[PDB]
Amino acid sequence: MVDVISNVAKDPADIPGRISRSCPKTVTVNLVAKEVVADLAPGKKFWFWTFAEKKGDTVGPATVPGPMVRVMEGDTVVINLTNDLHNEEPHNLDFHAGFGAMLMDIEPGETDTLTFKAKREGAYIYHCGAEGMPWEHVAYGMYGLIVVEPKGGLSRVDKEFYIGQGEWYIKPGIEDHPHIRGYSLDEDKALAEHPDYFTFNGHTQALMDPSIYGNAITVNQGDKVRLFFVAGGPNIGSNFHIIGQIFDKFYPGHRRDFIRNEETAYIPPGSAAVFEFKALATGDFLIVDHALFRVPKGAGGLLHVK
Amino acid sequence: MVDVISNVAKDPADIPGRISRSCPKTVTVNLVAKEVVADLAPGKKFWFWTFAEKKGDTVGPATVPGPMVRVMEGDTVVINLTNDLHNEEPHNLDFHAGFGAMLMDIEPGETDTLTFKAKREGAYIYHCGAEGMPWEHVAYGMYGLIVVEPKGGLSRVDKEFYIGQGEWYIKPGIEDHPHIRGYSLDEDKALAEHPDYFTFNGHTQALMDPSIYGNAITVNQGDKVRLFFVAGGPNIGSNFHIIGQIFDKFYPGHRRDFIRNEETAYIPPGSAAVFEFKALATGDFLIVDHALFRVPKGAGGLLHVK
Amino acid sequence: MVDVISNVAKDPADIPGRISRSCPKTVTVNLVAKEVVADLAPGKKFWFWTFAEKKGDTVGPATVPGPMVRVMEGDTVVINLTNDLHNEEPHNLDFHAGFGAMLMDIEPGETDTLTFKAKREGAYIYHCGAEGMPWEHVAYGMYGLIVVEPKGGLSRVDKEFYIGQGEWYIKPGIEDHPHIRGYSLDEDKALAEHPDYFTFNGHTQALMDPSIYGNAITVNQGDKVRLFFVAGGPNIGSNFHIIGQIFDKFYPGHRRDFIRNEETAYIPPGSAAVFEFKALATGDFLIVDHALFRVPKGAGGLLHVK
Amino acid sequence: MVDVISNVAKDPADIPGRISRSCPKTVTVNLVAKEVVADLAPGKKFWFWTFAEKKGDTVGPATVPGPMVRVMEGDTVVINLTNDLHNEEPHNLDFHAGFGAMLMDIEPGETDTLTFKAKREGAYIYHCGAEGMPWEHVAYGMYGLIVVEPKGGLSRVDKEFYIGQGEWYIKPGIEDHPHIRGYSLDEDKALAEHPDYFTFNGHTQALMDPSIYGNAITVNQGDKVRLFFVAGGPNIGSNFHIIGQIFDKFYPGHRRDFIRNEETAYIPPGSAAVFEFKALATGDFLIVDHALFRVPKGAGGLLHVK
Amino acid sequence: MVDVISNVAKDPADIPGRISRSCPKTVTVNLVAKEVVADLAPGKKFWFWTFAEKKGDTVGPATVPGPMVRVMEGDTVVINLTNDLHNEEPHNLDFHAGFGAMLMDIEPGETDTLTFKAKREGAYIYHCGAEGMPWEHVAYGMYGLIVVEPKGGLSRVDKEFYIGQGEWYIKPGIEDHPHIRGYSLDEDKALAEHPDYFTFNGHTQALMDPSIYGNAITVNQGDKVRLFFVAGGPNIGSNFHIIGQIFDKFYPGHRRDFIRNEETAYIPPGSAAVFEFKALATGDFLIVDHALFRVPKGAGGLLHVK
Amino acid sequence: MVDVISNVAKDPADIPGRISRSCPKTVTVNLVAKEVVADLAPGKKFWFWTFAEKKGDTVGPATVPGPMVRVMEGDTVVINLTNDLHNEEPHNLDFHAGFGAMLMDIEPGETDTLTFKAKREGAYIYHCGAEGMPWEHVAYGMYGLIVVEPKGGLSRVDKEFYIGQGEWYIKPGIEDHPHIRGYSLDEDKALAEHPDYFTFNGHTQALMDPSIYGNAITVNQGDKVRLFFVAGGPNIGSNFHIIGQIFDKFYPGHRRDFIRNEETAYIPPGSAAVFEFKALATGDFLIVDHALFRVPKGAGGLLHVK
């Protein structure tokens, strides 16, 4: 029987450590595909397909976006994916950071390993592309961010965070688990690109609710901040912008190629990027897609400066 | 009782003077938030929320986009905002050009001053973000462009213009002023991102009608032209392009970071940018968003070369 | 009476030869506007307005996107357009690569020549803008790509291809040719930006069907690949991305201005660009817009690496 | 009767203040041409022609190289030159930092003003070019350094110093002042480019003797150091290098154009340049021209790191 | 019997025409090696070995430096060298602009052709390297400048000039032509690098004497000036500098690689370079090597600004 | 008693292996200071002070320039210097590649280790600076080249070589070893900068004599060649140039900062640099300082292309 948890919100501080090395290495991460029911919005239970990071023998939590992977250019990257036994649909990986870096569909219970070399630096998206239906798998929340830093790592910053944006089309009733009163993917609404809710880090109120990481992204005044951003979509890009903030550096792919002083950057679906800004002003600031009516739909977050 | 004027179209030549100085200064502008009824489209009266520039004791006209602000990097910028006495909803400022450069909601009648230092160069958007509902306030037309030029100013050009694009969702009847037969904002159409009309400089026929600035943007052949462009949205970006024209320089944020020879540039909502092109061909040329069915809806302008 | 052919799919290998010269020249191409009925999707006949390239006395085939034009910066470009006698609506050219490079509407039967100098390098779109209704003419498939290479030509690559993306709004019945059972343009669906099908190179299954250029784009492992890409629209841009591939170079307009290591690039409607990537991984790879539900609608292609 | 002082050594710390402004200004300096007898080397009295800086009503000391002038690009530079009453030969100015920035020969007693605009940034040499014999006038020590910093000034550093290198050809006996037992310029040795002594800051032991600025150039470990360097010549350039030090930045003329990590830089006679290096190692370090036998001849200084 | 002419001074305006083409071509020049007696200095007859340019059937004059060659990058360069019948020593060519671009020693009377492709842009020196003794042949004045401009040519300028610097060691008596009372090369003085005279364009007073090209280099105020400079040596480089002038651009080899705002540039012997400066100041200005005692020896020229 | 060998010529192919790693390491080299008598020129025995590289238990040969050291930026460099027991004067190291990277004078017999971090990339000189008389120690031949390559190493080339230039002042008789008939350093000639011989790699005929490395530097046509060059001096720089060759890249200190297409580059004494060129022409080519009378004095080498 399916697990039913409060939410799949991803902490935007659960980030691997900064890179200060030039020696290539074999970086290795353990992932587990987890089908879960949880609140998408307040009062709305949704059937999620998520990624969870396994450390040692311990696993979870299940989140949207998935766990942030972090490596250096020239490293060898090993992702062990497991498909939980209590899942329904099969799953697999697809890393934009690698050349032909896709796994083969693994059945619930089986576990396979994906090995690939990260030979192009940048922020990339990774996702579930199983059954040749990447649309359906991403739509349910199976997407995360991988960053390949250059040799020596990116310029050091005071605080760093991770945000994944996505849109959701909800149909009441789940085909499986009919006992559960909650929503399932809507093909029609999805095909028509007419979403109901927008989410930052897997929840409509995530980054807006103190209980659900509402004060999670907080920085001291005068700090340099870096933001690893993904647009999971699966259809709508993000006109990303933070109120009262100016992006000193913006690079979608390479550190060297960037625009200075961007206010709002269009991040297309299925793409990741890096934002850099100094927190020169104190107080609360609203993180939002600048398609503003999107914000009421949940494209709304909160940055704190002390 | 509400004022009812023909239109809120903004002259795309009402531009402050070019900057040729390196001495920082305290540049100061007087704004007044003005709720007005006027033609959005021919035969359609709409309830606008606009910005107007006050010179000396004289104010107006009320326009969309709002008045262009123009400063140098390192200047100190002072905006005195006034909320007219005959307004309904409260208002405030939000400048993308400044760090935590937001005012506090001022009530109809009261007047506050916003002081901020412009320490990042570029073209930025400013707007009304009052009542924590920037979507509603921008949707009614409360958006304008500010440019922070580098020290010495941008490279001199023969002719310069100012264009703000926006989309509108209209509901017949205004909740207030029921006597007026005209349209008010539609939450549903707005939330669904399905606009009825598109406008350049606050009117569907603005830049297309000789009476309403139709021949306003005219330049001599062989001239260098610069265009300060804003995408007010509040939801739809602009695939900006001018027929028979090639953009020699395009920079969304910094002068140094630009692409040469762009044909169509995506300007996301809540963003401003600078276009530069030589008028090497004579005659009439259609300024349009390149989502072409948008053009019938009003995303259509006119450039004249003599 | 109208011609009725199986499809208007464009071979993504029918490309002019690479440029290795610095001597400017007068490059000349013969085009013929061809109204045709053909399969848009399997089982759906659509009324197309296309461009065809005339070599010597021989013409055709009629395709979407139109024939790729290819010149050097400083060349003199001569396009002879002919409007077939059995056409209905008038037509003309509009080249984004030239300054005021638009023809005048030519009637079915008449033939005019467009001469222009290509003095800005880059990948550009060209299209039919006749009757002052570029939306209607582009919507029916009258769009192609022109590239102006720098002097010496772009860096040489092993394999090169040409892809035009577009979206379609279909209404059953053609106003003309009522005898034909097939679909015509839908103003309403088009104005609302709610397309039914998406196409790569003029067909929903083109680049997916072995019969219809399905294995057309095939390259040997370790090859450098260049892709000339257009977004015909006429309303929807393309979040272009190829699965298992990383773009080493991406330039929308100038060769010099580009971003390294892009995964997904937003190509706005009415714009063309150049993608460059090494085929370091073997096997099949899905070419798609990353608005993934678009892929089921036909935004789906196939790249083969041996 | 001539003045006879111990030495004309220039303190390499008597430097104007750093520039942190972008507002152009009229910077003004008062100079006085001073013929003096002093020790060139220990036990060798030489007849010097020097420049001295007049502050307020007070003047002196007389030094080689002359006083460092320091301005910003776009400033207006005013140099009042005075030729002392007890001088013999006439004198004038010649600034490499200005376009046609030469005075006219002023007679002993008379005083003229040189006004010029500094519209090209960089480190330049200035000198006495009177009587159309710049060789004779420079040979006697009439040379100094002027730097035109960019707007905003050069990047700030912890410690800054000023060094002028020169070579000397000495003939016993002065034509004038026969009573004095000391040396005068040797035409023959000078014409043959065979100097006897080399000097840093006007003395053979200057920068080597604690009494004569020997510990004058001292910096704390980990400090950033900037060095304003002139090669007075008048015939021999300087293969400038500091032992145990690496120049992180070296620019002869423009800040932007520089080589990173230079060990020894050739500074041609009649040229000035800027060296930048971090003092990462403690202890004493020998400043020298790398024509090493030059060092015994006096091309030898001392840098201290604590 | 040997010819005896007044001087071998080269007009610094006898320059080929500017290049405004990108089409490679086969540029061809006819040279004739001419041994001549003439004034090196006033009252001093010297035995010169020079190059002369043959146009059509007409040849001469014989000059130092030799005739300026001027081509575009990618051209094919053909130099027909002739060794006059009344010469003594054999001669040949050696172009620094070409890969293995050396002729074979041609005997007096015989004529050979040198063909080479100019595939690296820049200013280069060419000279006589015959008998494996390039020192002896260059010492007598057999050196000239070749420039390979990029495709399109260098940026256009108002006025352009050509200057070759050299030093001379003179021995009274010529081994051949004993009847002539004049000077021949001195091995000892030459080997010891102790020259007697310095020359600009083959004469000590050339560029200083109105009769001998003294007012030859004259430009209008506000003009852009370009200078093609060679350092023939054969031993001493030139600390080139023009009084009252600042070099806006200086490139020894490639147009792209240059330093801005140089005052004095060291040009090593056997090297050529390009100087660029605006003539913003009127009047007379002294062109000189900044080894100033060199100027009395003849390293002295004259620039006029009106 | 002193050793007496034929010559101290250094093989310009005895070069450490190319670097293809980014992992910092502790690179370690064993040096031994060796006083030796040998032929400077044919028939002239000179008293040399040289460096020799000790591999394992085996040492020698003794050469000028000393052994080439080769490391990566960020490595830790360990040089064990030994002063042979049969030496007279004490010795020490001085690396331009390190911050305060000087040893203390070690007595004949004693052995010390120099540890330093190479944190600035480039080609540098190292030498003996013992007894505070670097002039005397370098003059006798105690100088070599160290290169700090960037992470990943310099771009790979087909063939690589090592050349050290120097000048010599010789006095007959050695103060020590009076039995030996040969020459010792001349203070006077040295102080006056009037050298007798010039040498490439420690011998006048080295690189010119088949027996003494005359055909040592040989490369196949079409090969890319890199040259690590030092100017030991100790007084005269090198106007380095190779006949029939063009330097595609020239960097004195940093790989990034370089000039393209240099013909002759001035390398000041006490400096090292990197030259890069393609061997597009076959046959013999003369390597020389372009102060051509220097070539007869021994500044003459030989490059072979097959």
Ligand SMILES: [Ca+2]
């Ligand atoms: Ca990315």
Ligand SMILES: [Ca+2]
């Ligand atoms: Ca902007």
Ligand SMILES: [Ca+2]
């Ligand atoms: Ca383009």
Ligand SMILES: [Ca+2]
């Ligand atoms: Ca300078």
Ligand SMILES: [Ca+2]
């Ligand atoms: Ca050159």
Ligand SMILES: [Ca+2]
């Ligand atoms: Ca170096």
Ligand SMILES: [Cu+2]
């Ligand atoms: Cu899945």
Ligand SMILES: [Cu+2]
């Ligand atoms: Cu993807």
Ligand SMILES: [Cu+2]
């Ligand atoms: Cu408002």
Ligand SMILES: [Cu+2]
């Ligand atoms: Cu905003």
Ligand SMILES: [Cu+2]
């Ligand atoms: Cu048409």
Ligand SMILES: [Cu+2]
């Ligand atoms: Cu178009």
Ligand SMILES: [Cu+2]
């Ligand atoms: Cu004087």
Ligand SMILES: [Cu+2]
């Ligand atoms: Cu000077």
Ligand SMILES: [Cu+2]
């Ligand atoms: Cu000759």
Ligand SMILES: [Cu+2]
């Ligand atoms: Cu040469």
